[PDB]
Amino acid sequence: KNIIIGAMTALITPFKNGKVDEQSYARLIKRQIENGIDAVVPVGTTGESATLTHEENRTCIEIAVETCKGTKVKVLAGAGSNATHEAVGLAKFAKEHGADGILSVAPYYNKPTQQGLYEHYKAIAQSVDIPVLLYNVPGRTGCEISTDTIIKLFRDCENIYGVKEASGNIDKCVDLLAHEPRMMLISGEDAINYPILSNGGKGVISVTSNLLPDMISALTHFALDENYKEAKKINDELYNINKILFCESNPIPIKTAMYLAGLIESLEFRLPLCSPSKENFAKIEEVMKKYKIKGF
Amino acid sequence: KNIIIGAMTALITPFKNGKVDEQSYARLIKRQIENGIDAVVPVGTTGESATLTHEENRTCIEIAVETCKGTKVKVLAGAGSNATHEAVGLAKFAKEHGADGILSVAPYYNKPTQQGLYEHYKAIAQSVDIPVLLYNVPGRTGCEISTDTIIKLFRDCENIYGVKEASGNIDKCVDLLAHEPRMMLISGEDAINYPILSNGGKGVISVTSNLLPDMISALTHFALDENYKEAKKINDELYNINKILFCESNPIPIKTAMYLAGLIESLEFRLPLCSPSKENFAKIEEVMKKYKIKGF
Numbered sequence: 001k002n003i004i005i006g007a008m009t010a011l012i013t014p015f016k017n018g019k020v021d022e023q024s025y026a027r028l029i030k031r032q033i034e035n036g037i038d039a040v041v042p043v044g045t046t047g048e049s050a051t052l053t054h055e056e057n058r059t060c061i062e063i064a065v066e067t068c069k070g071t072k073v074k075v076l077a078g079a080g081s082n083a084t085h086e087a088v089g090l091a092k093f094a095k096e097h098g099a100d101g102i103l104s105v106a107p108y109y110n111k112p113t114q115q116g117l118y119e120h121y122k123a124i125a126q127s128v129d130i131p132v133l134l135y136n137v138p139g140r141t142g143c144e145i146s147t148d149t150i151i152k153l154f155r156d157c158e159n160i161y162g163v164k165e166a167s168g169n170i171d172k173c174v175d176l177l178a179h180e181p182r183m184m185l186i187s188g189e190d191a192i193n194y195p196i197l198s199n200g201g202k203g204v205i206s207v208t209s210n211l212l213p214d215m216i217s218a219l220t221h222f223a224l225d226e227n228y229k230e231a232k233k234i235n236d237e238l239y240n241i242n243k244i245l246f247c248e249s250n251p252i253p254i255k256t257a258m259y260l261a262g263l264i265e266s267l268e269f270r271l272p273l274c275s276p277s278k279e280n281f282a283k284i285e286e287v288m289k290k291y292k293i294k295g296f
Numbered sequence: 297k298n299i300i301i302g303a304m305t306a307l308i309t310p311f312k313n314g315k316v317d318e319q320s321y322a323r324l325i326k327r328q329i330e331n332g333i334d335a336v337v338p339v340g341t342t343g344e345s346a347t348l349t350h351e352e353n354r355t356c357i358e359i360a361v362e363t364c365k366g367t368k369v370k371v372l373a374g375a376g377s378n379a380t381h382e383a384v385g386l387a388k389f390a391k392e393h394g395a396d397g398i399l400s401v402a403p404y405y406n407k408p409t410q411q412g413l414y415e416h417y418k419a420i421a422q423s424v425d426i427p428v429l430l431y432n433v434p435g436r437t438g439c440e441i442s443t444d445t446i447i448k449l450f451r452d453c454e455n456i457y458g459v460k461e462a463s464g465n466i467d468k469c470v471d472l473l474a475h476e477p478r479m480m481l482i483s484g485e486d487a488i489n490y491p492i493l494s495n496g497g498k499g500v501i502s503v504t505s506n507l508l509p510d511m512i513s514a515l516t517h518f519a520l521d522e523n524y525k526e527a528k529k530i531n532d533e534l535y536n537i538n539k540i541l542f543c544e545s546n547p548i549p550i551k552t553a554m555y556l557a558g559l560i561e562s563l564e565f566r567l568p569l570c571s572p573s574k575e576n577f578a579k580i581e582e583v584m585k586k587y588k589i590k591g592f
């Protein structure tokens with residue numbers, strides 16, 4: 001299978017006067033490239049996919065593809081939806097406009113059954129010829145892609161190559177790789193990046209890497225080389241910021257941190273997301289002081 | 297406040313060859329009117345709002361409004377979204393096209409904070425002058441509108457008049473009405489329709505009423521008349537079907553039951569929803585035999 005692995009960043013989407021700041025977006029992607037990141041994920045959960053239009057979703061994918069041209073860095077385009085016809089349309093656009101693969105979140109809100117999840121992802125995978133990474137985050141979607149469903153999709157669909165797990169369930173990570181060791185398990189939960197990698201995971205799709213791309217890149221690379229002492233050390237050092245970046249719903253803390261570090265010009269969200277509380281703003285700022293934050 | 301209460305039905309959306317069957321939809325709404333229902337909810341969760349287009353969402357609202365003309369039956373239009381700009385647009389269309397109020401589900405997937413939920417619903421409420429019913433269903437959305445947020449929105453926004461609760465939490469129902477007895481608490485959980493009504497709830501937005509509108513209407517109207525003995529009797533009689541209608545994710549079982557009863561011509565969903573397993577298909581058919589299902 002064609003795969004996209006390694007250290008990856010779920011890119012925030014900066015806004016300026018309620019509009020996608022397209023110049024800042026490219027600048028942020030360049031900073032990720034220059035700090036050892038291997039793939040960028042435009043318009044994931046962290047990129048506020050819910051509140052972008054279908055057009056803006058497509059624009060951000062285009063900026064990512066163009067910015068990564070001439071580099072090793074891959075574009076794993078966020079193209080999921082809770083409507084299969086929407087997810088197929090987004091996947092086809094990403095393929096047609098040069099994305100290296102797609103990240104496709106499990107349908108949210110409408111809670112498909114395991115059979116429905118299978119047909120949803122089968123329709124997506126058969127619509128394009130680029131790699132497809134499943135994305136399980138039951139705390140946000142209200143449903144769970146079971147291990148059996150993931151493994152069936154991996155075995156039945158040529159371009160489905162793994163899953164980004166954001167479920168706080170290391171038991172399931174063992175279940176997945178013990179029964180199907182050929183899939184690419186990707187950490188979608190920064191605090192447990194190292195445990196997932198040490199069990200045979202092959203990458204991360206990170207929130208923290210927006211702020212600290214060099215540290216997340218180093219962690220991942222040490223781990224892929226089985227330098228587990230060094231990878232665990234970085235995972236341990238990162239625990240405090242990894243947790244504080246979820247003191248409110250992601251991406252509220254990470255956008256706050258990027259603003260505090262001078263990496264984005266305005267702390268703007270699209271409703272229903274908004275600025276954090278004054279207390280949490282201060283806690284984010286306090287934890288940031290422990291870490292060395294790369295500029296541009 | 298202007299309010300919309302009583303026995304209400306979360307309408308299924310019938311499909312024929314992947315298209316909204318508009319004639320079947322109007323016929324189903326008339327059947328609800330003829331069986332004592334006080335309001336209908338087009339394109340809620342049960343109506344597969346997630347997989348309808350914005351335009352099909354607008355078409356079903358028009359059919360509901362047109363079918364209810366010349367009757368007391370109100371149209372409480374499903375107009376929620378996880379993007380505030382989407383929810384405002386849906387609310388404005390519903391108002392402009394004759395809906396009596398809107399049902400607005402809490403944002404799904406992106407998990408707004410309580411502050412974000414407040415600003416989300418304030419923006420919706422300030423965009424129209426018709427009643428707005430909040431809708432809390434954390435098992436599907438991944439977030440919870442707290443009692444404090446619900447009460448603040450009720451007190452601060454003239455047209456926010458209550459909440460549809462589908463959270464399996466009778467403690468919260470006590471919390472809501474003990475601190476704000478002026479709001480309209482609406483049951484969104486058929487099995488516990490009577491306990492919510494007996495605590496001062498003023499209506500239901502029902503899945504089961506799709507199949508048994510006369511029984512849900514009678515239950516609610518008995519309760520509103522403080523004939524709690526007769527209301528509980530119907531609630532107890534309905535428990536078996538109330539639970540089997542969630543043996544798979546709603547609306548998979550209710551559409552299956554409507555098809556088995558001959559009320560819709562095809563068992564068609566839009567992916568990622570699909571037909572139930574053969575076992576659950578048989579379980580639904582078995583539970584239905586206990587009940588008298590009205591025709592057209």
Ligand SMILES: NCCCC[C@@](N)(CC[C@](N)(CCCCN)C(=O)O)C(=O)O
Pocket residue numbers: 049050051052053054057081082083086109345346347348349350353377378379382405
């Ligand atoms: N990534 C950009 C697209 C965002 C669209 C949407 N906000 C809503 C998606 C939708 N399926 C639209 C249904 C519209 C008819 N009610 C949903 O709200 O479930 C989402 O998927 O979060």
Ligand SMILES: [Mg+2]
Pocket residue numbers: 147148
């Ligand atoms: Mg097993």
Ligand SMILES: [Mg+2]
Pocket residue numbers: 225
């Ligand atoms: Mg090496």
Ligand SMILES: [Mg+2]
Pocket residue numbers: 443444445447448
């Ligand atoms: Mg209060």
Ligand SMILES: [Mg+2]
Pocket residue numbers: 443444
């Ligand atoms: Mg309290």
